[PDB]
Structure formats: structure tokens, C-alpha cells
Design a protein around this motif. Sequence first.
Motif, PDB file in Angstrom:
ATOM      1  N   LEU A   1      11.574 -15.629 -11.599  1.00 36.19           N
ATOM      2  CA  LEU A   1      12.428 -15.419 -10.443  1.00 36.19           C
ATOM      3  C   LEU A   1      12.839 -13.959 -10.350  1.00 36.19           C
ATOM      4  O   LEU A   1      13.597 -13.455 -11.194  1.00 36.19           O
ATOM      5  CB  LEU A   1      13.685 -16.292 -10.527  1.00 36.19           C
ATOM      6  CG  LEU A   1      14.698 -16.137  -9.379  1.00 36.19           C
ATOM      7  CD1 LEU A   1      14.042 -16.400  -8.023  1.00 36.19           C
ATOM      8  CD2 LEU A   1      15.857 -17.099  -9.611  1.00 36.19           C
ATOM      9  N   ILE A   2      12.338 -13.281  -9.324  1.00 38.10           N
ATOM     10  CA  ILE A   2      12.652 -11.880  -9.105  1.00 38.10           C
ATOM     11  C   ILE A   2      13.939 -11.790  -8.293  1.00 38.10           C
ATOM     12  O   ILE A   2      13.976 -12.140  -7.102  1.00 38.10           O
ATOM     13  CB  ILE A   2      11.505 -11.179  -8.365  1.00 38.10           C
ATOM     14  CG1 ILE A   2      10.204 -11.384  -9.144  1.00 38.10           C
ATOM     15  CG2 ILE A   2      11.796  -9.675  -8.255  1.00 38.10           C
ATOM     16  CD1 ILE A   2       8.954 -10.908  -8.408  1.00 38.10           C
ATOM     17  N   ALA A   3      14.993 -11.315  -8.942  1.00 39.72           N
ATOM     18  CA  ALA A   3      16.298 -11.196  -8.319  1.00 39.72           C
ATOM     19  C   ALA A   3      16.504  -9.849  -7.642  1.00 39.72           C
ATOM     20  O   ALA A   3      15.910  -8.848  -8.027  1.00 39.72           O
ATOM     21  CB  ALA A   3      17.389 -11.433  -9.369  1.00 39.72           C
ATOM     22  N   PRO A   4      17.374  -9.809  -6.624  1.00 40.03           N
ATOM     23  CA  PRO A   4      17.677  -8.587  -5.871  1.00 40.03           C
ATOM     24  C   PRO A   4      18.385  -7.509  -6.687  1.00 40.03           C
ATOM     25  O   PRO A   4      18.205  -6.317  -6.447  1.00 40.03           O
ATOM     26  CB  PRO A   4      18.532  -9.107  -4.714  1.00 40.03           C
ATOM     27  CG  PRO A   4      19.287 -10.241  -5.362  1.00 40.03           C
ATOM     28  CD  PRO A   4      18.198 -10.938  -6.149  1.00 40.03           C
ATOM     29  N   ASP A   5      19.186  -7.924  -7.657  1.00 44.75           N
ATOM     30  CA  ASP A   5      19.923  -6.982  -8.488  1.00 44.75           C
ATOM     31  C   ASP A   5      20.312  -7.632  -9.812  1.00 44.75           C
ATOM     32  O   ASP A   5      20.106  -8.834 -10.004  1.00 44.75           O
ATOM     33  CB  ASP A   5      21.172  -6.504  -7.741  1.00 44.75           C
ATOM     34  CG  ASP A   5      22.016  -7.659  -7.224  1.00 44.75           C
ATOM     35  OD1 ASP A   5      22.128  -7.827  -5.984  1.00 44.75           O
ATOM     36  OD2 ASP A   5      22.553  -8.408  -8.062  1.00 44.75           O
ATOM     37  N   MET A   6      20.882  -6.843 -10.718  1.00 45.55           N
ATOM     38  CA  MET A   6      21.270  -7.344 -12.034  1.00 45.55           C
ATOM     39  C   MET A   6      22.396  -8.368 -12.000  1.00 45.55           C
ATOM     40  O   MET A   6      22.364  -9.354 -12.736  1.00 45.55           O
ATOM     41  CB  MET A   6      21.718  -6.204 -12.954  1.00 45.55           C
ATOM     42  CG  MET A   6      21.135  -4.834 -12.669  1.00 45.55           C
ATOM     43  SD  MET A   6      21.820  -3.639 -13.876  1.00 45.55           S
ATOM     44  CE  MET A   6      23.581  -3.550 -13.402  1.00 45.55           C
ATOM     45  N   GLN A   7      23.399  -8.131 -11.165  1.00 50.54           N
ATOM     46  CA  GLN A   7      24.538  -9.043 -11.086  1.00 50.54           C
ATOM     47  C   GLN A   7      24.047 -10.436 -10.713  1.00 50.54           C
ATOM     48  O   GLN A   7      24.380 -11.416 -11.357  1.00 50.54           O
ATOM     49  CB  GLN A   7      25.542  -8.542 -10.046  1.00 50.54           C
ATOM     50  CG  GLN A   7      26.932  -9.110 -10.204  1.00 50.54           C
ATOM     51  CD  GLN A   7      27.878  -8.574  -9.159  1.00 50.54           C
ATOM     52  OE1 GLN A   7      27.970  -9.106  -8.054  1.00 50.54           O
ATOM     53  NE2 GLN A   7      28.571  -7.497  -9.495  1.00 50.54           N
ATOM     54  N   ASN A   8      23.234 -10.513  -9.673  1.00 52.64           N
ATOM     55  CA  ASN A   8      22.699 -11.795  -9.245  1.00 52.64           C
ATOM     56  C   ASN A   8      21.880 -12.402 -10.381  1.00 52.64           C
ATOM     57  O   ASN A   8      22.022 -13.581 -10.687  1.00 52.64           O
ATOM     58  CB  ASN A   8      21.817 -11.609  -8.008  1.00 52.64           C
ATOM     59  CG  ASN A   8      22.242 -12.498  -6.843  1.00 52.64           C
ATOM     60  OD1 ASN A   8      23.352 -12.380  -6.325  1.00 52.64           O
ATOM     61  ND2 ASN A   8      21.350 -13.393  -6.432  1.00 52.64           N
TER      62      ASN A   8
END
Length: 308
Positions: free
Chosen positions: A19-26
Motif C-alpha cells: 500500500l503506497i501511502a500519500p505521506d508518512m503520517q497516513n
Amino acid sequence: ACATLVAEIAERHAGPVVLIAPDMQNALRLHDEISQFTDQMVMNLADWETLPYDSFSPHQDIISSRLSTLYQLPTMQRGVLIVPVNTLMQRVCPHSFLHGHALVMKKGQRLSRDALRTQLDSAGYRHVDQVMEHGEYATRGALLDLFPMGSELPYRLDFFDDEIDSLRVFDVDSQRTLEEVEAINLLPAHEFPTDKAAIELFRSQWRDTFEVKRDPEHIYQQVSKGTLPAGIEYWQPLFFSEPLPPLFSYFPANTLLVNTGDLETSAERFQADTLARFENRGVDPMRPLLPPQSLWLRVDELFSELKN
Ligand code: NA
């Protein structure tokens, strides 16, 4: 909505789901969310959290987590790997590094405490008075405590008759051992080798790439003297004789990649930032920088990998 769906896709897929997330927090958020919805393994590849070509090295606890993920990735037949897009764009040490530079310590092994210290120093571990964080080791009498990278807890080794008599998980707070183990796997303390052979390689490739100055502050001078400059990670390519591969090289068969968010703009923004930093700070007397492609996939290369 992403969490439950990724858990379902992974459940029915004969391979890992990335799962490629938009940013680290997410990304970090998605870890516990997805984990609670499945009985399959769920890992994150944590970002270094440093800026490109930063003057800081990432925290050892982040490195410990990454080493654990990279080590497990090639054989993660089922489950989910969550990775921020900017992190996915970062090249990594080849998997031959981990399984090649890892050391196994077993109960009954003929090895003195000092001989182990020597191996630990060359693997990048730090000698401290009391072990408390990943990548540290402390010695006293017949005892040697160490916090292996990738391990949840540190261990206490007892050397008797120059032999590892026992290896026991140990609780720092109470200063007491828990279960005994037959062996422990010791990974390197960095995503790059730092032993003398690695320093000779680093010096050689540095000379083929950059100018050398004798100012003790110069990167080449610091590494040659056995120290690791803050932010040395951004010269990671010099510690290996072959270019750093894409993270994609670690993915097992049938790996399925899922995208959540606007990866293109995020990817282009990051590439633009690393390029501006390189152009503005790349020519420096003490810390000349490697070109972005030595460390990151180009946005076009990323999307290509995403379609291969
Ligand atoms: Na479930």
C-alpha cells in the motif's frame, strides 16, 4: 476506507500487497488500522524522516525498524507492506547486504567476549556504559549486553570459558533476563557496511567522484578516521560497489501494488525538492553531494515500476 479494503485484497491475494501511502503520517496511521482487521503480517517501511541531503542522521530506532522490514520483505509471501510514496522512491541497500552481513550468535559458540566486541564495533554497534537503545552494546566482566537492530528487546550474553554460555532476552528497566534463546541474529547497525573493508571501498569510490580536502570537517576525512558524519546516509551509494537498487527488487512474486491518493503530484513535489537542494548545495567544499538519481528513482522510473 483504504484499511479494510487493503485487508480484504491481501486476504485473497496469493502474494504481498504493497500500500503506497500519500505521506508518512497516513502510513503510520494505516499500520494499526489494517493490523486490527487481519491475521496476516502487516509491516511499514519507515521513512528516515530526515530532509534530502540532511545534516542529521536518522534515529537508530527508525533504522532498526527498516532493517527488520527489509530483512523480512523477500519472504513475506502474504500480508501488507505500507510505504509512503517519497520513501518508496528511495533506493535501498541490496538484499545481498543483509543476509550477507548478518551474524549469528549461538549458545555454546566458541567466541570470547572481546572477539564479539570486535565484531559488534565493525558492524556499527556503539559501546556504551549501559544498553538502552537499538545499536548499543555494553560489556562488564563475563557479561555483554546488546540491543540488536530489528529486535524488540536487548539481550544479555554470558561468556564462560570463552564460550557463549547463554543468551537471554533482558528487560532494561528491571535489569533482569527473561527467556533464554538458542541463538540471535545480528544485523548491521546501518543500511550500509562500516567495517574497514567498507571504509576502504568508500574512500576509493569517493576519490573517483569528489575532491578531497584535509580539513578534519571534510566527509572523506571523517569516514577515513572511522567516524560517521551526521547525514552520512546520503552518501550510502559510496559504501557499495554496485548502484543501489529500487525497493521493488525486494518484492516477492505476485506482489500487488495499491495506490491511495495523488501520488503523481506528491512524487513530483519531492523530486523537485531534492533537485533544488542538490543544485543549491551540491557544490560544497566539505560535503559535496551525489546526484539525486544515485539515491532516488525518478518520477517516471517510479511509475514505470508501478506498471511492470
Ligand atoms: Na478480518
